[PDB]
């Protein structure tokens, strides 16, 4: 059957950043695997954080705390800022 | 090619020469199995072979351990 | 140094060191003295009356293992003078 | 206390002769073929006794002489006693006769304790002493049945009736195969430190009754056993020291050692200082 | 006499050449045979996808390169320029692999 992946979104982000630069297929696979790895790390950490406090749901607060736990320093600060902006824009729309 | 049979019945195929001594055969057995030659004794035609002799001095042989 | 673990002998192949050729290089008096520490059968009664090393006297399964054990014990520090004194004290305790 | 004895048929033969038994010897069985074992009075087998990790989970008692192993390194001696004192076709000698008479009615623990305090048996056992654990067990024909005697077991295990008292090799051969198939856990090519020996009546006596070359072979085997006993009981420390000192004083020792160096050098290991230096 | 470089120069040239490249340094067939021989012990008649042995080779090469870097660090610490098995053993002891 079909095998889903994040190829097109990474392609769009690359075209946004460097319009004239392409990307090889193996690099695309590496990027997709990296995205999946980060997603599973953050999801597992948020799940454990929610289970620690004996809650039933995963909200934005758990994701923010997990991001603060995983990403070190400036990456954490920028990621938190971007997440806050995205959440505010979505809730305003 | 010679065959060595153990108490358990394992068959060991060794590529040897007529001039090879008993020590050489036991060293090859050690290489194939890891059992030191000093704990190895070889019997051919119902007779245990002493150290220092060669194969031509005395095929399927028997290996025993001490 | 024939008794400290730091000796070269602990890294030396003694079995090929001591053999029929090594025995032959010795003088007759030293040969007889060394043979007097051998068992009573390895000393074959020669035609001349002097006991001789058997063809399979040193090239033995027992002698090779004895040499290996001696080298290992020298590595372990058994042969040092302090350990010898301790062994003598233990023997005094035993008897 | 007592010391371990090497699994050598000559060592056991010399033990038997030291105990005073006559007309019997110990031969080595190098294969499981039916031709390898003939008329025998007892089997001695060594596999191991390190399998003590997964722990914690009948009028023949008055007839069979079973002694529990209450002292270490007496497995060979207990096996020899099991083979001998339960066999009435050999000359047990005055020592073993008196031991059997005095210790017949005792409990297996009492039998083993009385054995451990026997002076002559202890001296004979320790006569071969040198200046992964392995264990000895015995298989014996008693009252037409196979009995396995082990010093760490409660009582002899009956493996079924014999085909015959005089002909009992094949029934024990399958038991030996089963025992081998358990230690190696299936594939027999995992452990090979097994040892099998047979206590058989004196070959020389049978050959003389019926072979002069066979008598010469037996005499030479006995001489070899004597040589092995002398070597195992001989201390070569002074001999080696004198040899090395003489070689060093003569001079060639240095070059001979430089030639036979055993370990490759210039690779971290400290080769050490020269002989007769410091 | 023909041109003969001083010892240690070809070492630096090869170091640069193999540090600026990315291809596999172990030939395919010997590694594949080794993998099959090792796997023969657990289950018989196993079959391997090509990508499986490729991933195994990549992981093995990366592990060996990291181990050699740590070994070189230990050897330099020992005031030597030559690596010896004691260095590898010390590295694997410190890493916690032994």
């Amino acid at each position: 059957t079909r095998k889903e992946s994040y190829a097109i979104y990474v392609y769009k982000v690359l075209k946004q950043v460097h319009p004239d630069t392409g990307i090889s297929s193996k690099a695309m696979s590496i990027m997709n695997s990296f995205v999946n790895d980060v997603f599973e790390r953050i999801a597992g950490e948020a799940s454990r954080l929610a289970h620690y406090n004996k809650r039933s749901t995963i909200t934005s607060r758990e994701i923010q705390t997990a991001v603060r736990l995983l990403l070190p320093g400036e990456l954490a600060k920028h990621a938190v800022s971007e997440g806050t902006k995205a959440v505010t824009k979505y809730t305003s729309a | 090619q010679i065959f060595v049979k153990t108490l358990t019945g394992k068959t060991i195929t060794l590529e040897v020469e007529p001039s090879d001594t008993i020590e050489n055969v036991k060293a090859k057995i050690q290489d194939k199995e890891g059992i030191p030659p000093d704990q190895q004794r070889l019997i051919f035609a119902g007779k245990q072979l002493e150290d220092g002799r060669t194969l031509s001095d005395y095929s399927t042989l028997h290996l025993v351990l001490r | 140094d024939f008794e400290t673990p730091g000796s070269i002998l602990v890294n030396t192949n003694l079995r090929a060191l001591i053999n029929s050729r090594t025995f032959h290089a010795l003088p007759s008096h030293f040969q007889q003295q060394l043979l007097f520490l051998l068992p009573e059968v390895d000393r074959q009664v020669g035609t001349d009356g002097l006991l001789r090393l058997s063809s399979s006297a040193l090239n033995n399964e027992f002698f090779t293992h004895a040499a290996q054990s001696w080298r290992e014990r020298l590595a372990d520090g058994e042969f040092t003078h302090e350990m010898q004194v301790r062994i003598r004290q233990e023997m005094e305790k035993e008897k | 206390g007592w010391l371990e004895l090497e699994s050598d048929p000559g060592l056991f033969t010399l033990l038997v002769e030291d105990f005073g038994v006559k007309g019997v010897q110990v031969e080595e069985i190098y294969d499981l073929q039916s031709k390898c074992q003939g008329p025998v009075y007892g089997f001695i087998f060594l596999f191991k006794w390190i399998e003590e990790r997964r722990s914690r989970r009948d009028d023949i008692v008055n007839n069979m002489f079973f002694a529990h192993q209450l002292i270490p390194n007496s497995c060979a001696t207990h096996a020899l006693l099991s083979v001998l004192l339960n066999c009435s076709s050999v000359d047990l000698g005055p020592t073993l006769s008196r031991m059997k008479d005095f210790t017949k009615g005792f409990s297996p623990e009492s039998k083993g304790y009385a054995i451990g305090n026997a002076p002559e048996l202890a001296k004979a056992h320790n006569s071969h002493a040198r200046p992964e654990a392995f264990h000895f067990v015995s298989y014996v024909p008693i009252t037409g049945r196979l009995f396995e005697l082990d010093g760490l077991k409660v009582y002899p295990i009956d493996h079924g009736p014999w085909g015959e008292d005089e002909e009992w090799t094949d029934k024990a051969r399958r038991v030996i195969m089963e025992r081998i198939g358990l230690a190696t856990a299936g594939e027999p090519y995992h452990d090979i430190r097994f040892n099998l020996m047979a206590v058989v009546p004196d070959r020389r006596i049978k050959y003389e009754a019926r072979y002069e070359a066979c008598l010469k072979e037996e005499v030479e085997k006995r001489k070899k056993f004597k040589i092995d006993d002398q070597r195992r009981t001989h201390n070569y420390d002074e001999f080696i020291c004198t040899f090395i000192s003489m070689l060093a004083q003569e001079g060639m020792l240095a070059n001979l050692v430089e030639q036979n160096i055993s370990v490759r050098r210039r690779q971290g290991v400290s080769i050490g200082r020269l002989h007769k230096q410091r | 006499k023909p041109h003969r470089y001083r010892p240690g120069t070809v070492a630096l040239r090869e170091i640069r050449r193999y540090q600026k490249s990315t291809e596999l340094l172990i030939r395919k067939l010997p590694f594949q045979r080794l993998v099959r021989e090792i796997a023969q012990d657990f289950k018989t008649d196993l079959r391997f996808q090509s990508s499986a042995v490729m991933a195994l080779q990549e992981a093995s090469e990366a592990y060996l390169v990291a181990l050699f870097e740590d070994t070189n660090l230990c050897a330099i610490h020992a005031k030597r320029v030559t690596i010896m098995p004691k260095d590898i053993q010390l590295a694997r002891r410190i890493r916690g692999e032994r």
Binding site: - | - | - | - | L12, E37, L46
Partner: protein, 81 residues
């Protein structure tokens, strides 16, 4: 039957691997230790991968099994999905 193919990792291959790692001078006994270490690592990884394959009732080891076995060891690998 394949036997003693560990010798297939020739000395020049180990030399190239050491060169990539920044090693200048190499002793003579390094090669045997390197072969032993490689054998141990491959044994562990292949054991885990074969267990994964056995659980799924398959007779072919796939790339995903190797990736999962590596991830269990802490050696996460990218590029093979």
């Amino acid at each position: 039957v394949l036997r003693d193919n560990i010798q297939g990792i020739t000395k020049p291959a180990i030399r190239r691997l050491a060169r990539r790692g920044g090693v200048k001078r190499i002793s003579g006994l390094i090669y045997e230790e390197t072969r032993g270490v490689l054998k141990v690592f491959l044994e562990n990884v292949i054991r885990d991968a074969v267990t994964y394959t056995e659980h799924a009732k398959r007779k072919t080891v796939t790339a995903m099994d190797v990736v999962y076995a590596l991830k269990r060891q802490g050696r996460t690998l990218y590029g093979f999905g």
